[PDB]
């Protein structure tokens, strides 16, 4: 009823949900793509896929279990889902995969087949997923030569050069008890899980701490992947944002909610209380846009992504959007701040109070790894309601006004002006 957190060597964290009809048990490691290098980039993604390999999944399915794995920038997860009663069967599989097995999943035929699978996977993403590919390039240029610049799926070049040894090296260096948290969500009790874990013994690399490196840094820059054969222009643009556990974490998320998301083809989306919408609908400057406040351990990105077929008016799209951002520093109104509060609460509620145990597992593990605990919506909502117009203006004057930007784009971006023209729009002339 408040999320329990116990440690006996292995940190166990659970979140009991009485309305849930299933249960998820897994392990979340405090290491992701941000802990790789340009040459082993994609190793985590390769691990995810061998864990989700047919051999491993068939074994789990026979037991009535479903496997899930997510590779993020700061973390990595491996979850098993089952009925509330088969919760102990999940632990056995989990125990087996990360303690008993090794040479079973890393066999020549399984590794090569899995490698070939992720290779075609990544190739398709880079070849067809334009909005996400652009967002990945935003991170790449914004944090270039820094941990946060590496794509989570890895790069084709490094992927084709990866061997079983690379996987093992990463596992020995990151899949450690000191860098992990065993999570339990859905319909399960803490005692049931802690005792079932405390039932077994061993340690498997005890006291071993993960590798350390240099911190993430934001660099005003841009990467342009022009492709005149594509039907649209896809653009992502952002300034240095807030890291997780930043004092302005919510103020930044609220600022992003002010401008929000938009889908020109959805009737209700066109009626939102967003001033930018009055400027962009007259000549239909875009098909959609979405503002974000991405937060990581060392840094973050605040900005937006947009897609448009109006290739001759991209300059107006960017101009109007950045002119609106200017407003956060000098003229954002009370009702805009109040509307943002309500919608932010709804966003967080939908994110944290989702009816999915695997989602809760990922969120719970990631947070307890970073701050040792998980913040409740009750506390989050209180912080949000305390945000004032002066807080937004103070934050904007620091993060937005006359600040460097990172830009990424693909498709028909001839109309996207030079860096300086876009950068100049981060402020307004004053007397």
């Amino acid at each position: 009823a408040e999320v329990t957190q116990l440690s006996n060597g292995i940190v166990v964290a659970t979140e009991h949900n009485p309305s849930a009809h299933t249960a998820s048990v897994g392990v979340v490691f405090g290491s992701g793509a941000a802990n790789e290098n340009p040459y082993n980039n994609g190793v985590s993604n390769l691990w995810k896929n061998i864990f989700l390999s047919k051999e491993n999944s068939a074994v789990a399915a026979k037991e009535g279990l479903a496997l899930s794995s997510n590779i993020s920038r700061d973390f990595q997860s491996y979850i098993v889902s089952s009925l509330p009663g088969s919760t102990d069967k999940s632990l056995d599989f989990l125990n087996q995969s990360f303690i008993q097995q090794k040479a079973n999943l890393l066999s020549s035929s399984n590794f090569e087949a899995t490698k070939k699978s992720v290779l075609k996977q990544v190739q398709d993403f880079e070849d067809n997923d334009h909005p996400n590919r652009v967002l990945e390039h935003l991170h790449s240029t914004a944090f270039q030569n820094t941990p946060l610049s590496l794509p989570t799926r890895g790069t084709l070049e490094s992927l084709e050069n990866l061997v079983v040894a690379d996987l093992e090296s990463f596992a020995n260096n990151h899949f450690l008890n000191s860098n992990a948290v065993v999570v339990g969500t859905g319909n399960i009790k803490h005692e049931d899980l802690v005792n079932s874990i405390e039932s077994k013994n061993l340690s498997l690399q005890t006291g071993t701490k993960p590798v350390l490196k240099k911190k993430a840094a934001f660099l005003g820059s841009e990467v342009r992947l022009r492709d005149d054969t594509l039907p649209k222009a896809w653009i992502s643009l952002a300034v240095e944002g807030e890291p997780v556990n930043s004092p302005n974490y919510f103020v930044a998320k609220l600022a992003a909610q002010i401008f929000g998301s938009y889908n020109a083809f959805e009737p209700a989306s066109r009626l939102q209380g967003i001033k930018l919408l009055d400027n962009i609908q007259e000549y239909q400057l875009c098909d959609n846009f979405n503002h974000f406040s991405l937060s990581y351990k060392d840094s973050g990105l605040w900005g937006f992504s947009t897609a448009t077929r109006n290739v001759t008016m991209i300059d107006d799209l960017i101009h109007f959007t950045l002119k609106q951002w200017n407003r956060l520093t000098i003229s954002v109104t009370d009702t805009e701040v109040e509307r943002a509060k309500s919608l932010l609460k709804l966003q967080l509620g939908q994110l944290y109070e989702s009816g999915n145990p695997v989602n809760d597992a990922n969120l719970l593990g990631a947070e307890v790894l970073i701050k040792g605990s998980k913040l409740s919506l009750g506390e989050a909502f209180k912080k949000i309601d305390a945000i004032t117009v002066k807080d937004v203006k103070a934050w904007a004057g620091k993060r937005l006004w006359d600040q460097d930007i990172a830009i990424a784009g693909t498709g028909q971006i001839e109309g996207l002006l030079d860096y300086m023209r876009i950068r100049s729009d981060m402020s307004m002339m004053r007397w």
């Binding site: 054969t229 030079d418 860096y419 300086m420």
Partner: protein, 49 residues
């Protein structure tokens, strides 16, 4: 008869203009720094279109 005053104004004028000229060069270089150090890479597209 304007000789003395003309030369005096000339000193003021050349000093201000020389400074403006040097200042403008520096300002120009800054505004162009992004374009000047710009880098391009070519990866021949896959034959399909």
């Amino acid at each position: 008869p304007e000789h003395d005053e003309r030369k005096r104004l000339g000193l003021k004028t050349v000093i201000i203009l020389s400074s403006l000229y040097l200042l403008s060069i520096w300002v120009k270089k800054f505004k162009w720094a992004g374009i000047k150090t710009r880098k391009f890479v070519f990866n021949p597209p896959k034959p399909r279109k």
